[PDB]
Amino acid sequence: QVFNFNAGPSALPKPALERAQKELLNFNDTQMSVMELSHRSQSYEEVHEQAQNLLRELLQIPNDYQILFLQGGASLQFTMLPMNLLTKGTIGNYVLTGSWSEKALKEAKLLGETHIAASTKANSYQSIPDFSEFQLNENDAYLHITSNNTIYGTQYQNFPEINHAPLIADMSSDILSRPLKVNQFGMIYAGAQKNLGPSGVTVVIVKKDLLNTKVEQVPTMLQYATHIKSDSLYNTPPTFSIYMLRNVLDWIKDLGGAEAIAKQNEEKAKIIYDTIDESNGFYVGHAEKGSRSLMNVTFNLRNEELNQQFLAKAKEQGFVGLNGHRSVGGCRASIYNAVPIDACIALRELMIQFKENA
Amino acid sequence: VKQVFNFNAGPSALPKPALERAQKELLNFNDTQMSVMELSHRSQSYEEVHEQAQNLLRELLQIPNDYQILFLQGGASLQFTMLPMNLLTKGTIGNYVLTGSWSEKALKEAKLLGETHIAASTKANSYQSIPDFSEFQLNENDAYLHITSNNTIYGTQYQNFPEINHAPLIADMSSDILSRPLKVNQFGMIYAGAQKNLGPSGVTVVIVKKDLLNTKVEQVPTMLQYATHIKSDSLYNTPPTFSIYMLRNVLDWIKDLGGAEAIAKQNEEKAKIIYDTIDESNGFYVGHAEKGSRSLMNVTFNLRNEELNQQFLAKAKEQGFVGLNGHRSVGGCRASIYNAVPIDACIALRELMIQFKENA
Numbered sequence A: 001q002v003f004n005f006n007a008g009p010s011a012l013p014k015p016a017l018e019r020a021q022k023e024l025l026n027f028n029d030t031q032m033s034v035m036e037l038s039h040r041s042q043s044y045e046e047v048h049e050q051a052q053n054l055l056r057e058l059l060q061i062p063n064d065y066q067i068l069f070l071q072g073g074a075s076l077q078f079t080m081l082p083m084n085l086l087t088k089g090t091i092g093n094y095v096l097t098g099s100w101s102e103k104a105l106k107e108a109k110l111l112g113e114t115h116i117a118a119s120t121k122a123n124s125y126q127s128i129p130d131f132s133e134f135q136l137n138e139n140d141a142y143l144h145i146t147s148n149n150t151i152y153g154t155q156y157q158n159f160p161e162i163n164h165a166p167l168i169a170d171m172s173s174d175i176l177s178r179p180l181k182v183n184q185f186g187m188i189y190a191g192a193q194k195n196l197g198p199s200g201v202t203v204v205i206v207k208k209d210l211l212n213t214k215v216e217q218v219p220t221m222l223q224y225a226t227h228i229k230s231d232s233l234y235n236t237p238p239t240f241s242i243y244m245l246r247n248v249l250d251w252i253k254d255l256g257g258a259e260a261i262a263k264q265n266e267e268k269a270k271i272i273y274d275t276i277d278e279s280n281g282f283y284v285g286h287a288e289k290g291s292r293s294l295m296n297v298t299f300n301l302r303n304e305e306l307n308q309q310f311l312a313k314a315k316e317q318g319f320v321g322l323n324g325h326r327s328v329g330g331c332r333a334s335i336y337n338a339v340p341i342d343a344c345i346a347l348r349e350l351m352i353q354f355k356e357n358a
Numbered sequence B: 001v002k003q004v005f006n007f008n009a010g011p012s013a014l015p016k017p018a019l020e021r022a023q024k025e026l027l028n029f030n031d032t033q034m035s036v037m038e039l040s041h042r043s044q045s046y047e048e049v050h051e052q053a054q055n056l057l058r059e060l061l062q063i064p065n066d067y068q069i070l071f072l073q074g075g076a077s078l079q080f081t082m083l084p085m086n087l088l089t090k091g092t093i094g095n096y097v098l099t100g101s102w103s104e105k106a107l108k109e110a111k112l113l114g115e116t117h118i119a120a121s122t123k124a125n126s127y128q129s130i131p132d133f134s135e136f137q138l139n140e141n142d143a144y145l146h147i148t149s150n151n152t153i154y155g156t157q158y159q160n161f162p163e164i165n166h167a168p169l170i171a172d173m174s175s176d177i178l179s180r181p182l183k184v185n186q187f188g189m190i191y192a193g194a195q196k197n198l199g200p201s202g203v204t205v206v207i208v209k210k211d212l213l214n215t216k217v218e219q220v221p222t223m224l225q226y227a228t229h230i231k232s233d234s235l236y237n238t239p240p241t242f243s244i245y246m247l248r249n250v251l252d253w254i255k256d257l258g259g260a261e262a263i264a265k266q267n268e269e270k271a272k273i274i275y276d277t278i279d280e281s282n283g284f285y286v287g288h289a290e291k292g293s294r295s296l297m298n299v300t301f302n303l304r305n306e307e308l309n310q311q312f313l314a315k316a317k318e319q320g321f322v323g324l325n326g327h328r329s330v331g332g333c334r335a336s337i338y339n340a341v342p343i344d345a346c347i348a349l350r351e352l353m354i355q356f357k358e359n360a
Ligand SMILES: *Cc1c(COP(=O)(O)O)cnc(C)c1O
Pocket: A008, A072, A073, A074, A075, A076, A100, A146, A148, A149, A150, A170, A171, A172, A173, A191, A194, B237, B238, B239
C-alpha cells in the first residue's frame, strides 16, 4: 500500500535495513551499536575498509584511484572540486545538462574562470549534447559533467574520451546503477542517498595523482589531500552512514553486481517508458528518447489540471515522491536500484487506470 | 562474552532507550511504511523530526528565541574554517583562547583566512589549566573571541565563562554541550559535533544569534555561508536525516530524565567517583588537569610509567572497557564520561583501578 518513489533520500534494499535493525544494539558481537564505536576501533575500521573494497570490486576501480567518504553532500563537492583544481590561469569547464550542472558551475564561478563546453539549456535540457559539440580549452583545469540529471530525467548513455584535463562527474543519481569504465574519469562523486544508502556521506573516487598534493591556502577540511592521506579518517566520519553504505553494497554484490543491477534497472524503466509511449500523447516524457534516464523518469499530462488530478490520485493510492520538480512540472518517478519492479508495475497500472477514467 | 564499559571519546555511548526506539521503528517510521532513512527531507514526517530536535534543544538549553539552531555536516572541524570565513574580515582579528589541541586546530584554520591573536594560553603549562580571565588580551577590532569549553584531549574544562561584550564570544562546545545548564545569551555562537554528548556522528549543531553570522559574505561558497543554512532551516541540501533523528531521540531521553540540571547532577557524581579514586591513590594515578580546571566529561590520567600504563590498559580491554587509551599528547588514559556513559561503568572503572593498584 506504499510505493516509495522518493528522489533522495530514497528507498533502501530491504535486506540492508533488516540487517541493520537486527544488529542495531550489538554489532559484530561487541554488544554495542555500530554508532557507538570509535572510528579508531578495529570494529569500525573493518566496516570502513569493507565499504571501500566493495566499491572497488563492484565498479572495478583501478588501484591508482582512492575512494573517499566525505561529509557535506554532493553540494559541498561543487565548491571543493574547484578549490582544489581551479588554479590561476586555468578554466573550470562545464557541460550543462540540467539544474545540478548549473549549481556546480555557479560554485566554480565564485572561485575562478569558467567556461561552458556545451549546453542544452536553450532546449530545456531535453537531451545530452553530442560530444562532438564540446568546446575544450588547452588550459582547462577539468571538464565537469552530470551523468544523470535528476531533475530533468536525462542521462549520459556513455561518456566522452577526455584526456587534455580530467573528466569530473557528479554521479549522485546514477552511481553503481550500471558498470563504469572508471579510467575515463579523473574524479567521480556522489551523495550516497540516491543509489548507495542513506544521506550523510558522499563517495568520491579520485585518481590519486591528480589530487593527493596539498593546495596552497585551502582550508584543511577542504583539501582532498587531507582525506587521502588520512583514509577519510582525518576527523570523525559519518560512521552509521558508512555502515549502511557497506550494507547496500553487499546487497548489490549478492544480486550479481553492476551488470545484474543494470539489467533490473533497464527492465523496470521499460515498464514506465512503454506506458508513456503507448499513451497516445496522454503522458509525454520530458526527455528526448535517446537521452532518457533509467533512474528518474519525468513526464507531464496535457495540462496542469490533469497533472494535479493524477498526482492527487497517486497520493491517495499510496505513491510517495512523484511530484515533479517545478522546472519540469508534472511527475518524476525516481526508480533507483532499490525501487522494486513491482512498484514500477503498480505505477504503470495507476497510469493506465487514470487515463481510462479521465 | 565481555561486559561493556563504553568510555569512547567520540563517537561514544548512546542512551539505551534511544537505540531501542530507533531499532523498533527502523523499518516503519510514523506509520509511513518507510524507514526514517528512506523519507524525503521535504516530507512532513521528516520535517516534524527536524523541528522536534530543534525544539528539544531550545527547551533543554533554554535557547532564546532570537537564536537559530542549525544542523550541518562536516563535524566541528569544518566549523573551524566556516566561522572565520563568515566573520573574519579584512581589518578584524580572530582572537583565540588556547586551552588545548582542539583550540589550536581552530586557531590554525583562522590563520589561513585572516589576522589572528592569542588572547590567553596555557600551552606553556601543558594545558593543565584554564587561564584566569584577567589574563585575556582583547582587541577593539576583534571579529570574535573563540574558546573551547571542554578540552577533550587534555581533560580540562571551563567551570564558568568570561563576560565578553567587546566582540562576539564563540565556543567549541563539542565535548560538553548539554552536560549542564548553559547561559546561551553569553555567546554569539556555539557549535558542537553531535557525537560526544548529543547523538551519533554525522551532524554538527550550531546555535547562533540570528543577528550575527550572515552578512558581508558574497565571496563565500554557498555551502560555507551560514546564511544559506539559516534561510533554508538546514534543508538547503540533503541533511543527515538519520543523525538528526537519533539526536532527537537522545534529546527526548535527556528531557525524560529531568533535563540539564538532572544530567549535571549525574555527571558530577560520575566524575567524582573517578577523581576521588585518582586523588586517594597516593600518586599511583596522577591526573593531568589541575584540580580547579578538571573536566567533568573527559578524565585524563597516567600511571607512574609507560609499562604500567600499558599493563593497565591491557587489563581494562580484557575486562570489557572500551576507549580508555589516552591521546598521545598526554599519553596514559582518558575516561570519557559523557551524558550517556552510565554511573555503573564509572563504578567498574574505580574497581579496576583499585584492583590494579593493589595487584601491581
Ligand atoms: C541530489 C543531487 C545533488 C545534491 O546532493 P546533496 O547531497 O543534497 O548536496 C547533486 N547532484 C545531483 C545530480 C543530485 O541528484
